[PDB]
Design an enzyme around this catalytic site. Structure first.
Site, PDB file in Angstrom:
ATOM      1  CE1 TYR A   1      22.424  -1.875  29.204  1.00 55.97           C
ATOM      2  CE2 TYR A   1      21.227  -3.036  27.477  1.00 55.97           C
ATOM      3  CZ  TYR A   1      21.444  -1.892  28.233  1.00 55.97           C
ATOM      4  OH  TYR A   1      20.673  -0.784  28.064  1.00 55.97           O
TER       5      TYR A   1
ATOM      6  CG  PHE B   1      21.013  -4.747  18.700  1.00 55.99           C
ATOM      7  CD1 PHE B   1      22.147  -4.091  19.182  1.00 55.99           C
ATOM      8  CD2 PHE B   1      21.093  -6.127  18.468  1.00 55.99           C
ATOM      9  CE1 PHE B   1      23.323  -4.801  19.440  1.00 55.99           C
ATOM     10  CE2 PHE B   1      22.265  -6.835  18.741  1.00 55.99           C
ATOM     11  CZ  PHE B   1      23.379  -6.171  19.215  1.00 55.99           C
ATOM     12  CG  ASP B   2      19.563  -0.659  24.820  1.00 57.21           C
ATOM     13  OD1 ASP B   2      20.253   0.360  24.548  1.00 57.21           O
ATOM     14  OD2 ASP B   2      19.293  -1.048  25.958  1.00 57.21           O
TER      15      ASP B   2
ATOM     16  CB  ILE C   1      12.941  -6.471  33.344  1.00 56.42           C
ATOM     17  CG1 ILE C   1      14.319  -6.781  32.724  1.00 56.42           C
ATOM     18  CG2 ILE C   1      12.121  -5.492  32.522  1.00 56.42           C
ATOM     19  CD1 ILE C   1      14.240  -7.501  31.388  1.00 56.42           C
TER      20      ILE C   1
ATOM     21  CE1 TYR D   1      10.347  -3.071  30.337  1.00 57.53           C
ATOM     22  CE2 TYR D   1      11.523  -4.621  28.933  1.00 57.53           C
ATOM     23  CZ  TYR D   1      11.527  -3.499  29.744  1.00 57.53           C
ATOM     24  OH  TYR D   1      12.732  -2.944  30.019  1.00 57.53           O
TER      25      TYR D   1
ATOM     26  CG  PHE E   1      19.433  -8.520  28.126  1.00 59.48           C
ATOM     27  CD1 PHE E   1      18.158  -9.006  28.375  1.00 59.48           C
ATOM     28  CD2 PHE E   1      19.606  -7.144  28.009  1.00 59.48           C
ATOM     29  CE1 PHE E   1      17.083  -8.153  28.523  1.00 59.48           C
ATOM     30  CE2 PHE E   1      18.517  -6.302  28.145  1.00 59.48           C
ATOM     31  CZ  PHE E   1      17.267  -6.788  28.376  1.00 59.48           C
TER      32      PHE E   1
HETATM   33  C1  LIG Z   1      11.504  -0.271  28.304  1.00 62.14           C
HETATM   34  O1  LIG Z   1      12.335   0.829  28.011  1.00 62.14           O
HETATM   35  C2  LIG Z   1      13.663   0.511  27.766  1.00 62.14           C
HETATM   36  C3  LIG Z   1      14.200  -0.805  27.641  1.00 62.14           C
HETATM   37  C4  LIG Z   1      15.572  -1.009  27.354  1.00 62.14           C
HETATM   38  C5  LIG Z   1      16.082  -2.343  27.172  1.00 62.14           C
HETATM   39  C6  LIG Z   1      15.779  -3.172  28.451  1.00 62.14           C
HETATM   40  O2  LIG Z   1      14.767  -3.857  28.538  1.00 62.14           O
HETATM   41  N1  LIG Z   1      16.602  -3.053  29.517  1.00 62.14           N
HETATM   42  C7  LIG Z   1      17.753  -2.110  29.588  1.00 62.14           C
HETATM   43  C8  LIG Z   1      18.827  -2.634  30.552  1.00 62.14           C
HETATM   44  C9  LIG Z   1      18.276  -3.129  31.863  1.00 62.14           C
HETATM   45  C10 LIG Z   1      17.315  -4.240  31.621  1.00 62.14           C
HETATM   46  C11 LIG Z   1      16.127  -3.776  30.817  1.00 62.14           C
HETATM   47  C12 LIG Z   1      15.301  -2.833  31.530  1.00 62.14           C
HETATM   48  O3  LIG Z   1      14.926  -3.017  32.680  1.00 62.14           O
HETATM   49  O4  LIG Z   1      15.200  -1.606  30.927  1.00 62.14           O
HETATM   50  C13 LIG Z   1      14.346  -0.462  31.423  1.00 62.14           C
HETATM   51  C14 LIG Z   1      15.142   0.277  32.458  1.00 62.14           C
HETATM   52  S1  LIG Z   1      14.881   0.076  34.124  1.00 62.14           S
HETATM   53  C15 LIG Z   1      16.141   1.121  34.554  1.00 62.14           C
HETATM   54  N2  LIG Z   1      16.694   1.644  33.441  1.00 62.14           N
HETATM   55  C16 LIG Z   1      16.140   1.138  32.310  1.00 62.14           C
HETATM   56 CL1  LIG Z   1      16.678   1.650  30.750  1.00 62.14          CL
HETATM   57  C17 LIG Z   1      15.471  -3.030  25.931  1.00 62.14           C
HETATM   58  C18 LIG Z   1      16.105  -4.449  25.768  1.00 62.14           C
HETATM   59  C19 LIG Z   1      15.739  -5.061  24.339  1.00 62.14           C
HETATM   60  C20 LIG Z   1      15.833  -4.223  23.163  1.00 62.14           C
HETATM   61  C21 LIG Z   1      15.229  -2.868  23.438  1.00 62.14           C
HETATM   62  C22 LIG Z   1      15.616  -2.300  24.771  1.00 62.14           C
HETATM   63  C23 LIG Z   1      16.415   0.108  27.172  1.00 62.14           C
HETATM   64  C24 LIG Z   1      15.851   1.401  27.276  1.00 62.14           C
HETATM   65  O5  LIG Z   1      16.509   2.558  27.126  1.00 62.14           O
HETATM   66  C25 LIG Z   1      17.930   2.567  27.144  1.00 62.14           C
HETATM   67  C26 LIG Z   1      14.523   1.589  27.579  1.00 62.14           C
HETATM   68  O6  LIG Z   1      14.054   2.898  27.661  1.00 62.14           O
HETATM   69  C27 LIG Z   1      14.166   3.371  29.014  1.00 62.14           C
END
Ligand SMILES: COc1cc([C@@H](C(=O)N2CCCC[C@H]2C(=O)OCc2scnc2Cl)C2CCCCC2)cc(OC)c1OC
Length: 128
Positions: A45, A55-56, A75, A101, A118
């Site tokens: 992704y 951006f991730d 999420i 969030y 995404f």
């Molecule tokens: C809220 O914290 C985080 C959220 C993400 C990213 C994110 O929101 N996700 C990462 C891929 C799965 C969907 C969603 C999410 O649930 O992320 C938190 C989780 S839950 C299990 N592992 C992660 Cl990572 C963000 C998307 C938009 C731009 C900034 C990142 C990556 C993150 O780290 C790689 C993260 O730190 C843990």
């Protein structure tokens, strides 16, 4: 941009039909099987704030992102969206805060009331 295109053309895949999770299929996958709750799911992704401020990407470690579907380990939008996908499919998701969030956000990485985008590739899924 791709987020606007999802606004304009995306299917609403929420049960409540509140446009909280909108989807476009960008590349069709194979077969008819989509994953069930509990399946282990492997994706690549790229993700960003709709704004474009953060951006991730899984492709950072060129290593798939792995999770168990429908257990709220990610999420809610991902539980909803990845469940609709076939193996080999690539999809765009645009996501209202209620399915990401929320009002709290996840500071400092995610602000309050954030919309997320995404691009997701479903690589594989396997039974638990
Ligand atoms: C809220 O914290 C985080 C959220 C993400 C990213 C994110 O929101 N996700 C990462 C891929 C799965 C969907 C969603 C999410 O649930 O992320 C938190 C989780 S839950 C299990 N592992 C992660 Cl990572 C963000 C998307 C938009 C731009 C900034 C990142 C990556 C993150 O780290 C790689 C993260 O730190 C843990």
């Amino acid at each position: 941009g791709a987020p606007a295109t999802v606004t304009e053309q995306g299917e609403d895949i929420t049960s409540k039909k509140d446009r909280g999770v909108l989807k476009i299929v960008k590349r069709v996958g194979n077969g008819e099987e989509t994953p069930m709750i509990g399946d282990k799911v492997y994706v690549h992704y790229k993700g960003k704030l709709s704004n474009g401020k953060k951006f991730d990407s899984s492709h950072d470690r060129n290593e798939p992102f792995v999770f168990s579907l429908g257990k709220g380990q990610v999420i809610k939008a991902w539980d909803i969206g990845v469940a609709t996908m076939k193996k080999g499919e690539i999809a765009h998701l645009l996501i209202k805060p209620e399915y990401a969030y929320g009002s709290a956000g996840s500071l400092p990485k995610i602000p309050s009331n954030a919309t997320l985008f995404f691009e997701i590739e479903l690589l594989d899924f396997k039974g638990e």
